């Protein structure tokens, strides 16, 4: 199926709250954590703890201490560029995806106060800037050709190799399938209106397709889609509703299901 690896950084100036937090994920699973309070990088998944020796955690604890310091300075510089005082946020997201079809994606992005600031394009080796402050930064970063090449290599080769390594460590969790339990609920709501709800729960992975069809064909009417939500036990739940021959169609991990009303 599709899998992803991503590392986030969050920097907060003058916090109420850690000044710096970094979290890693594989798919929807936290794998690693570091903050300016613990000053230690730690596993967040037991399959990460069991497969990476103490030297991995010791080395990355040092790297994260260094990155924490640089993040603080970069945020001070951004505030000075914007003439901003008080508390502001700086975020980074790096990562890659290995798609089921075999294709790969790689991404590296920054945000200031929760909005896109700089987006790296690894195919053109350039940074897309949202405003004149981001442009000043883009010019400074793009002057270092070796760093752009290094980032392209990391996204395309290193990130994918780390992802495949973690996917194997966490295979019993990440590569399992828990099929959905699906039901259809019918209810007369406002007088003369009938609502049909197709509800699914207990599934893993969270990715699920749900739709309503009329006489074996795609509807013209509006379907309301429930969010895919964590149930708290490692599984997920979702729904789709319509108002009014109707049938609910569910696709999950290569299996199709139809519930005719």
């Amino acid at each position, epitope marked *: 199926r599709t899998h992803s690896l991503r590392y986030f950084r969050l920097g907060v100036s003058d916090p109420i709250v850690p000044e710096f937090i970094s979290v890693g994920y594989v798919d929807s699973h936290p794998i690693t954590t570091y903050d300016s309070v613990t000053r230690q990088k730690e596993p967040r998944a037991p399959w990460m703890a069991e497969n990476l020796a103490p030297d991995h955690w010791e080395r990355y604890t040092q*790297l994260l*201490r260094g*990155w924490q310091q640089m993040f603080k300075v970069e945020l001070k510089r951004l505030q000075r560029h914007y003439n901003h005082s008080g508390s502001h946020t700086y975020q980074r997201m790096i990562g890659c995806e290995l798609l089921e079809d075999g294709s790969t994606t790689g991404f590296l992005q920054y945000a200031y106060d929760g909005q896109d600031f700089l987006i790296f394009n690894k195919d053109t080796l350039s940074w897309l800037a949202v405003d004149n402050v981001a442009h000043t930064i883009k010019q400074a970063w793009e002057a270092n050709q070796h*760093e752009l090449l290094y980032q392209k*290599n990391w996204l395309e080769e290193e990130c994918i190799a780390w992802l495949k390594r973690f996917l194997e460590y966490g295979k019993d969790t990440l590569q399992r399938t828990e099929p959905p339990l699906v039901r259809v609920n019918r209810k007369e709501t406002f007088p003369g209106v009938t609502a049909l709800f197709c509800k699914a729960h207990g599934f893993y992975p969270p990715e699920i397709y749900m739709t309503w069809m009329k006489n074996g064909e795609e509807i013209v009417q509006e379907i309301d889609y429930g969010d895919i939500l964590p149930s708290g036990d490692g599984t997920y739940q979702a729904w789709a509703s319509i108002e009014l021959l109707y049938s609910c169609h569910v696709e999950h991990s290569g299996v199709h299901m139809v519930l005719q009303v």
Partner: antibody, heavy 108, light 112 residues
Framework: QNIDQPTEMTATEGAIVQINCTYQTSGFNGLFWYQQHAGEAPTFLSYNVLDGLEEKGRFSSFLSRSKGYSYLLLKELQMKDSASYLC??????????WGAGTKLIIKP | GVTQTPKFQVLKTGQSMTLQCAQDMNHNSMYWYRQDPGMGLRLIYYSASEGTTDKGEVPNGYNVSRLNKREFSLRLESAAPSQTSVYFCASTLGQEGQPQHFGEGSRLTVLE
């Protein structure tokens, strides 16, 4: 993890020399060359991370990622090129693995 | 650049020694290496940024202090003949492959 480069090479003044370096690293984040004259500090010469040849004056540095191979090419050799050339690979954890160096001797 | 001292030092076995290293390039990372014939540079200790240090490949018989952003000192608490070597301090802007800038080197000879 291992970096392999010849112990010593000898070439003639005015000619060309290619110093090979093979790396067997746990992941790859770049390949560096440094120059170190006798009794002096090493100084940065080059960095390669993607495939290709990068030219800087009389010196060129090549990388083949699929072969895990690099070379440092020195053209129009001068007596001042007599030095040790250090190859260093960066692994997945951004740590350098330093080669034992190639001592380059130039014949006048 | 990187300023390291002393250039030369003779020590008797058991004596203490501190090597000094400073850089005014606003670099975050600093390193102490030993260079011996027939082998690649070996990292003793490093400092990823001000406020942190960690062991390299050969930390036994040494300790370090990242005094401030500029300074990274190397100490030999009880000099041993095996510590006869050429020591190099280096610094880099960051931790991800920015070029290393080296000090002049310190030639230490430990004698009984």
């Amino acid at each position: 993890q291992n970096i392999d480069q010849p112990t010593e090479m000898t070439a003639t003044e005015g000619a060309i020399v290619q110093i090979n370096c093979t790396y067997q690293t746990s992941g790859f984040n770049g390949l560096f060359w440094y120059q170190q004259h006798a009794g002096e500090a090493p100084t940065f010469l080059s960095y390669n991370v993607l495939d290709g040849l990068e030219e800087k004056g009389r010196f060129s540095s090549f990388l083949s990622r699929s072969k895990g191979y690099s070379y440092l090419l020195l053209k129009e050799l001068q007596m001042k090129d007599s030095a040790s050339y250090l190859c260093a690979g960066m692994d997945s954890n951004y740590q350098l693995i330093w080669g034992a160096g190639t001592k380059l001797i130039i014949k006048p | 650049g990187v300023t390291q001292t002393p250039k030369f030092q003779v020590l008797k076995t058991g004596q203490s020694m501190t090597l000094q290293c400073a850089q005014d390039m606003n670099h975050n990372s600093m390193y102490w290496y030993r260079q011996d014939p027939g082998m690649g540079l070996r990292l003793i200790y490093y400092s990823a940024s001000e406020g942190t240090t960690d062991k390299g490949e050969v930390p036994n018989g040494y300790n370090v202090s990242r005094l401030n952003k500029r300074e990274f000192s190397l100490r030999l608490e009880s000099a041993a003949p095996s510590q006869t070597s050429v020591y190099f301090c280096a610094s880099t802007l960051g931790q991800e492959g920015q070029p290393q800038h080296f000090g002049e080197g310190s030639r230490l000879t430990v004698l009984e």
